[PDB]
């Protein structure tokens, strides 16, 4: 019924101490059968994919949304971070949220 | 103003390297993303890819391969360097500003644009 | 992969009259699609901007209008100055693709 849709703020920024938890936000929207999100940290000019981690999802009214754990958060976090979508064959991303530990 | 100020043209030999400057007034690179399009004589608009207002750089499919897209924020000057180069790569190379208009999606168009390098590639 | 496609090749108008610009998208760009004019020997320059909004200094003869594959650039009141080339462009993705841009259309005068 509409397009998938990731909405992650310009400018986000997070200024959190180490080994508290955290739980890092992407508000995707959608209106079909949930879509694959995945997670990336900027290094360079890559955003190199993260791979095995806590994630869950958090259903709302209009919108839901996919959550990133940080269990706990460690020194060696400090950077900007991204959420990605694959569906329709392609690769949308969102705007990235920069982490201050 | 806001302008966007290219380098000088070219003249290259097939399989050497080209690096086109882009400079930046009135305005913050960290903030942009700058885009690259090329046009051969009588062609139409053919994007090589961009460096956004993150850093992260973007490749067309096709160019991957030899294309380099770098940018020093200090200085405020985006290049383009094209590498083994063919005599097909004979066109003009815009650089164009990316405005990421939407503050939620990650989305742009180019409202900017640099005023052409011609690069010729012959041997 | 996301493909734009522009329709008619080339429109023969005269001055005065109303143009209709078409570009379809492969798969949906939702209403990231601007919309350029290149003059020969110019750098292009924006128009229109996500699928329906006017750039910086542009005549409120140009409109946009769609989203998600169907687009259109109306000019209704076609000045000489408007006879040029227009290309459409996503916005939306940027990840292996070919071009973000769709293969133009030429407006030219009929006499």
């Known amino acids: 019924s509409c397009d998938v849709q990731l909405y992650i703020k310009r400018q986000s920024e997070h200024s959190i101490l180490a080994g508290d938890p955290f739980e890092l936000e992407c508000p995707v929207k959608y209106c079909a059968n949930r879509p694959h999100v995945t997670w990336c940290k900027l290094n360079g000019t890559t955003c190199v994919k993260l791979e095995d981690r806590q994630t869950s999802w958090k259903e709302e009214k209009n919108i839901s949304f996919f959550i990133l754990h940080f269990e706990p958060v460690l020194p060696n976090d400090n950077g900007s971070y991204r959420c990605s979508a694959n569906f329709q064959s392609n690769l949308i991303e969102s705007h990235s949220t920069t982490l201050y530990v | 103003q806001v302008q966007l100020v290219q380098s000088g043209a070219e003249v290259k030999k097939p399989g050497a390297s080209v690096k086109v400057s882009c400079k930046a007034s009135?305005?913050?690179?960290?903030?942009?993303?700058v885009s690259w399009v090329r046009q051969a004589p009588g062609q139409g608009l053919e994007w090589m890819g961009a460096i956004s207002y993150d850093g992260i750089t973007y490749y067309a499919s096709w160019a991957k391969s030899r294309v380099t897209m770098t940018r020093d924020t200090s200085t405020s000057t985006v290049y383009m360097e094209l590498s083994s180069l063919r005599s097909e790569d004979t066109a003009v190379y815009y650089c164009?500003?990316?405005?990421?208009?939407?503050?939620?999606?990650?989305?742009?168009?180019?409202?900017?644009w640099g005023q052409g390098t011609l690069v010729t590639v012959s041997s | 992969e996301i493909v734009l496609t522009q329709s008619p090749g080339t429109l023969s108008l005269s001055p005065g009259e109303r143009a209709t610009l078409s570009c379809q998208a492969s798969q949906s760009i939702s209403t990231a699609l601007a919309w350029y004019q290149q003059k020969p020997g110019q750098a292009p320059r924006l128009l229109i901007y996500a699928a329906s909004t006017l750039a910086s200094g542009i005549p409120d003869r140009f409109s946009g209008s769609g989203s998600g594959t169907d687009f259109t650039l109306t000019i209704s009141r076609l000045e000489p100055e408007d006879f040029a080339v227009y290309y459409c462009?996503?916005?939306?993705?940027?990840?292996?693709?070919?071009?973000?841009f769709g293969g133009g259309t030429k407006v030219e005068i009929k006499r």
């Open positions: 164009a500003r990316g405005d990421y208009y939407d503050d939620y999606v990650y989305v742009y168009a180019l409202d900017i």
């Open positions: 462009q996503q916005g939306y993705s940027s990840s292996n693709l070919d071009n973000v």
């Open positions: 009135g305005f913050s690179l960290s903030s942009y993303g």
